Amino acid sequence: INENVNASKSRIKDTDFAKETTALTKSQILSQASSSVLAQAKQAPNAALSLLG
Amino acid sequence: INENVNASKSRIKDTDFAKETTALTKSQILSQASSSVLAQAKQAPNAALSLLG
Amino acid sequence: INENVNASKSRIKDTDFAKETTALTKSQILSQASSSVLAQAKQAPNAALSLLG
Amino acid sequence: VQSRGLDVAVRNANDGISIAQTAEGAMNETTNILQRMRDLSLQSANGSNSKSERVAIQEEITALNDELNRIAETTSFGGNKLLNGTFSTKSFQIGADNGEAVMLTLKDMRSDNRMMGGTSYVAAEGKDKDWKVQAGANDITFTLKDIDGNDQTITVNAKEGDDIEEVATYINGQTDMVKASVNEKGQLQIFAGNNKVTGDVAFSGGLAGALNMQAGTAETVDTIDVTSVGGAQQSVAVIDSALKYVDSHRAELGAFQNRFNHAISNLDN
Amino acid sequence: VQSRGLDVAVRNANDGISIAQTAEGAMNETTNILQRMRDLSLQSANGSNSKSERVAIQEEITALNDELNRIAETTSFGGNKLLNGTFSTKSFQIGADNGEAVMLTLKD
Amino acid sequence: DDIEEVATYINGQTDMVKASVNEKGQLQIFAGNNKVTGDVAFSGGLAGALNMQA
Amino acid sequence: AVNVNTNVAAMTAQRYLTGATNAQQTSMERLSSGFKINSAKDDAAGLQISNRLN
Amino acid sequence: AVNVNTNVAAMTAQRYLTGATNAQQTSMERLSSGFKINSAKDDAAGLQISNRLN
């Protein structure tokens, strides 16, 4: 019973690096991209002063 | 099924960076272009002053 | 028979890692190339603004 | 319009390859379950197994049968079931103009689909261990109409002095259209895969007269019973016929994918 | 007039190259489909393959065949179908003055 | 088929009604107002056995 | 003719990228399973003979 | 399409990884136990025959 129960507990509690490690990487790339877009966005308003000024 | 379903969901909702990145770059160009034209346009009435001389 | 049948099944279904790995390597390299030229391509319109407003 | 249309077409085509991919994946598991059932059936055939053993095997076969049906009645694409048979001859437009659509037909993969089986003719006269092919009565005639309607006549001249079991093995070797198997009583059975033979097989010849073959009962994977050696041998064939049907559908989908992939490449160019 | 005509002529010729590009590109996929068919044929030829196998190969062959006919009846330049036979012997005026046109014929 | 298999089959044959089974083993048919308006007149021999209620 | 509304060159590269990306997935998939034919699209005849040999 | 919110390649790799992990554990048991039919999941019929023989 102990062996089977420990197996059962794993499925519901232990983390699967396979999916977890992937999920981490995904978050990292999205964050890196998001910030890049944010940097572009920060410069966007500069258009007015830069041109019409 | 989940794997194929996830792949399908991607085609309909995921962002094709290759396509979007080019679109962003294109949008900025047209933007800077229009701005330059607009600046040139604002100067149009300046002509009259000379005619008024 | 079982031995020869298994051998026969492999030749038609097995993955020759040697060729497959080589292929994947080439595929990744090709991808990196496409990505590099894609980058230079996005810069094309930049010439227009440089040409003039 | 054409450019924008071509874009939408590429998407429509991507949807097509997706629906197909899901269906193909489901049929994959279907194949694995069928293979397990076939092996369990062969284990059941061995005389060593007593009724209790066959009862045990049957229980697993019942379970896998239900699992096959489940896969078919559950596999869905966002809600549209793809294997129960509801999806049928659906058109997937893959062009920037009207009418360019390419058809796609998903066949029912239920374990009771007429295709996933055939017909079983069983002899009426059981031959004891001391029965041998009698000289002059060693001819069995198989008159059937294949699948394309083309009629064929398989004429198997059994080797003189062979036991009922050897008779079956001989037939199994002298043809691929019909499959033979000897039941517990010795009554030779003949299974005709709906995929291979259509209509009804006709048995003529002296050996046929001695065997007294009876009419054929439609047998599907859903109707297999390995509780009796006779049922076990028959089931092996029923599963084999099905494995074909399943693989055939998968192959057609395979092309549908290849074709749609090719369309995508042409469309983008 | 010559200068203005030369401009339109350059445009007309650009359209010409465009039509050829569209057609040539479609034929690129035509070739791949055919080559796939060739390999599948050589497979079916091998003796080990049984009648059942040949049936399967034929199914893929049949599908690819329809694709060639699809590409033929679809490839178009804004509704002007190209590689199906309907488009043939079309002159492209690439000269400022009249009667200066190169002829293009797209075979079925 | 078992009562569960009945529900799965029903769920596969139609989209208007979604069938399910409670702990007591009683088939539950749900109908979305977004898809079905009014009542549902269950009929037939199986319904005679199931005895669908209000 | 420097143009901004269209970058055919970009389209060309993206098209070949998609070709290379799909290639990687196909290869990687085969490497992971160890099976050259993991779907009929790989080789219908093989799927058939290999399943039957299996 | 160099997308980021999905990685079917990984999903495919994982599916096979699991398959291998389970297969490793399955054989590891048999090796330690010394018995192929460790659980009823294997040769349910053999279980009955083995037990009856034992």
In three state form, how does the secondary structure of chain D look?
Answer: CHHHHHHHHHHHHHHHHHHHHHHHHHHHHHHHHHHHHHHHHHHHHCCCCCHHHHHHHHHHHHHHHHHHHHHHHHCEECCEECCCCCCCCEEECCCCCCCCCEEECCCCCCCCCCCCEEEEEEECCCCCCCCCCCCCCCEEEEEECCCCCCCEEEEEECCCCCCHHHHHHHHHHHCCCEEEEECCCCCEEEEEECCCCCCCCEEECHHHHHHCEEEEEEEEHHHCCCCCHHHHHHHHHHHHHHHHHHHHHHHHHHHHHHHHHHHHHHHHC
Q: Which residues pair with D77 in a beta bridge?
A: D80
Q: Is B5 on the interface with C (CB under 8 A)?
A: no
**The amino acid at G22:** N
D144 close to D152: Cβ distance less than 8 angstroms:
yes
Token readout for C32 is 């990196």
Phi, psi (degrees; rounded to nearest 5) at D204:
-130, 160
Neighbours of H54 (CB within 10 A): 5
**The amino acid at E48:** S
**The amino acid at C3:** E
Q: Which residues contact A17 (CB under 8 A, 6 or more apart)?
A: none
Burial string for D134-161 (b: 16+ CB within 10 Å, else e) reads: eeebbbbbbebeeeeeeeeebebebeee
Coil, strand or helix at F21: strand
- Flag if D255 and G44 touch (Cβ within 8 Å): yes
Q: Which of residues 34-53 of G touch E (CB under 8 A)?
A: 44-45, 47-49
Judge residue D120's burial from the number of C-beta atoms within 10 Å of its C-beta, 0-12 exposed, 13-18 middle, 19 or more buried.
buried
What's the Cα-to-Cα distance from D121 to each of D30, D187, D189, rounded to whole Å?
27, 10, 6
**The amino acid at D184:** E
Coil, strand or helix at A15: coil
How many Å separate Cα A17 from the centre of its chain? 15
What's the Cα-to-Cα distance from D14 to each of C44, D7, D10, E22, rounded to whole Å?
30, 11, 6, 22
Coil, strand or helix at F28: strand
Tokens 């000289």 locate to: D135
Helix %, strand %, coil % for chain F, to 5? 30, 20, 50
Q: Is A40 on the interface with B (CB under 8 A)?
A: yes
Say how far apart CA H19 and CA D63 lie, in whole Å.
22
Tokens 């190969």 locate to: E57
- Tell me which long-range contacts G12-17 makes (C-beta under 8 A, separation of at least 24): G12/C41, G13/C34, G13/C37, G13/C38, G13/C41, G14/B16, G14/B18, G14/B19, G14/B22, G14/C34, G14/C38, G15/D268, G15/D269, G16/C30, G16/C34, G17/B18, G17/C31, G17/C34, G17/C35, G17/C38, G17/H2
Coil, strand or helix at F20: strand
Token readout for C8 is 């026969």
A29 close to H4: Cβ distance less than 8 angstroms:
yes
Sheet with D152-157, side-by-side order of all strands: D152-157, D139-144, D202-204
Residues in chain F within 8 Å Cβ distance of D66: 5
- CA atoms within a 13 Å half-sphere pointing along the CA-CB vector of H51: 10
- For chain G, give the residues followed by a break (C–N over 2.5 Å): none
- Flag if G4 and B22 touch (Cβ within 8 Å): no
- CA atoms within a 13 Å half-sphere pointing along the CA-CB vector of H6: 22
Phi, psi (degrees; rounded to nearest 5) at D48:
-50, -45
Q: Is B43 on the interface with C (CB under 8 A)?
A: no
Q: Which residues pair with E101 in a beta bridge?
A: E93
- Flag if B39 and A51 touch (Cβ within 8 Å): yes
Token readout for D65 is 């049968």
D117 close to D194: Cβ distance less than 8 angstroms:
yes
F21 close to F28: Cβ distance less than 8 angstroms:
yes
Q: Which residues contact E70 (CB under 8 A, 6 or more apart)?
A: D95, D100, D102, D263
What's the Cα-to-Cα distance from A23 to each of B10, G24, H20, rounded to whole Å?
16, 21, 21
**The amino acid at E33:** I
Neighbours of A45 (CB within 10 A): 9
Q: Which of D204, D137, D197, D124 is nearest to D167 (CA)?
A: D137
- Flag if G44 and D254 touch (Cβ within 8 Å): yes
Q: Is C45 on the interface with B (CB under 8 A)?
A: yes
- CA atoms within a 13 Å half-sphere pointing along the CA-CB vector of D122: 15
Q: Is the dihedral of CA C26, C32, C36, C42 positive or negative?
A: positive
Coil, strand or helix at G20: helix
Neighbours of D32 (CB within 10 A): 12
H helices of F1-54, in order, are: 3-13, 45-50
Say how far apart CA D157 and CA D139 lie, in whole Å.
5
**The amino acid at F30:** F
First-to-last CA distance in chain E? 39
- Tell me which long-range contacts B14-17 makes (C-beta under 8 A, separation of at least 24): B14/H1, B14/H3, B14/H4, B14/H5, B14/H6, B15/H3, B15/H4, B15/H5, B16/G14, B16/H1, B16/H2, B16/H3, B17/A33, B17/H1, B17/H2, B17/H3, B17/H4
Nearest-Cα residue of chain H relative to residue G31 = H13
Say how far apart CA B36 and CA G4 lie, in whole Å.
15
What's the Cα-to-Cα distance from B48 to each of A4, B40, B51, C13, rounded to whole Å?
92, 15, 5, 82
Residues in chain D within 8 Å Cβ distance of H49: 48-49, 53
Q: Which residues pair with D203 in a beta bridge?
A: D142
Q: Which of D242, D257, D223, D255 is nearest to D108 (CA)?
A: D242
Interface residues on G facing C, Cβ-Cβ cutoff 8 A: 2-4, 7, 9-10, 12-14, 16-17, 19-21, 23-24, 27-28, 30-31, 33-37, 43, 46, 49-50, 53-54
DSSP state at residue G5: S
Q: Is the dihedral of CA D228, D233, D238, D243 positive or negative?
A: positive
Token readout for A5 is 């129960």
Token readout for F9 is 């089959």
What's the Cα-to-Cα distance from C39 to each of A32, A38, H21, rounded to whole Å?
18, 20, 41
* CA-based max dimension of chain E: 72
H helices of C1-53, in order, are: 2-13, 17-42, 46-51
Token readout for D172 is 């199994």
Interface residues on B facing H, Cβ-Cβ cutoff 8 A: 2-3, 6-7, 9-11, 13-19
Nearest-Cα residue of chain E relative to residue D249 = E56
Q: Which of G17, D234, G31 is nearest to C16 (CA)?
A: G31
Touching, G vs B (3+ Cβ pairs under 8 A)? yes
Q: What is the dihedral of CA F1, F5, F6, F7, to 10 degrees?
A: 170
C12 close to G49: Cβ distance less than 8 angstroms:
yes
Residues in chain C within 8 Å Cβ distance of B40: 53
- CA atoms within a 13 Å half-sphere pointing along the CA-CB vector of D97: 13
- CA atoms within a 13 Å half-sphere pointing along the CA-CB vector of B18: 22
Say how far apart CA G15 and CA G2 lie, in whole Å.
22
Data resolution in angstroms: 2.5
- Flag if H45 and D48 touch (Cβ within 8 Å): no
Neighbours of D20 (CB within 10 A): 26
Q: Is the dihedral of CA B13, B19, B25, B30 positive or negative?
A: negative
Token readout for C3 is 């031995």
Say how far apart CA A19 and CA A16 lie, in whole Å.
6
Q: Which residues pair with B35 in a beta bridge?
A: none
How many Å separate Cα G39 from the centre of its chain? 12
Token readout for D186 is 């010795």
Neighbours of A7 (CB within 10 A): 10
Subunits with 3+ Cβ pairs within 8 Å of C are B, G
Q: For testing the chain B interface, which of A29, A42, A51, A52 should be mutated: the one with the most B CBs within 10 Å? A: A51
**How large is the angle between the packed helices E2-45 and D229-268, nearest 10 degrees?**
160
Q: Is C15 on the interface with B (CB under 8 A)?
A: no
DSSP state at residue F32: -
Q: Which of G35, B25, D239, F26 is nearest to C42 (CA)?
A: B25
The nearest CA of chain G is from the CA of E21 a distance in Å of 13
R_g over Cα of chain G? 18
The nearest CA of chain B is from the CA of G51 a distance in Å of 21
Q: Which residues contact B34 (CB under 8 A, 6 or more apart)?
A: none
Say how far apart CA E27 and CA E35 lie, in whole Å.
12
Touching, E vs F (3+ Cβ pairs under 8 A)? no
Q: Is C48 on the interface with B (CB under 8 A)?
A: yes
Method used to obtain the model: cryo-EM
Residue by residue, DSSP assigns chain E as: -HHHHHHHHHHHHHHHHHHHHHHHHHHHHHHHHHHHHHHHHHHHHSTTS-HHHHHHHHHHHHHHHHHHHHHHHH-BSSS-B-TTTTS-SEEEE-SSSSS-EEEE----
Say how far apart CA D82 and CA A13 lie, in whole Å.
34
H helices of chain A, in order, are: 2-13, 17-43, 46-50
Q: Is the dihedral of CA D142, D146, D151, D154 positive or negative?
A: negative
H or E, element range at H35: none
- Kindly report the length of chain F: 54
Say how far apart CA C24 and CA C3 lie, in whole Å.
31
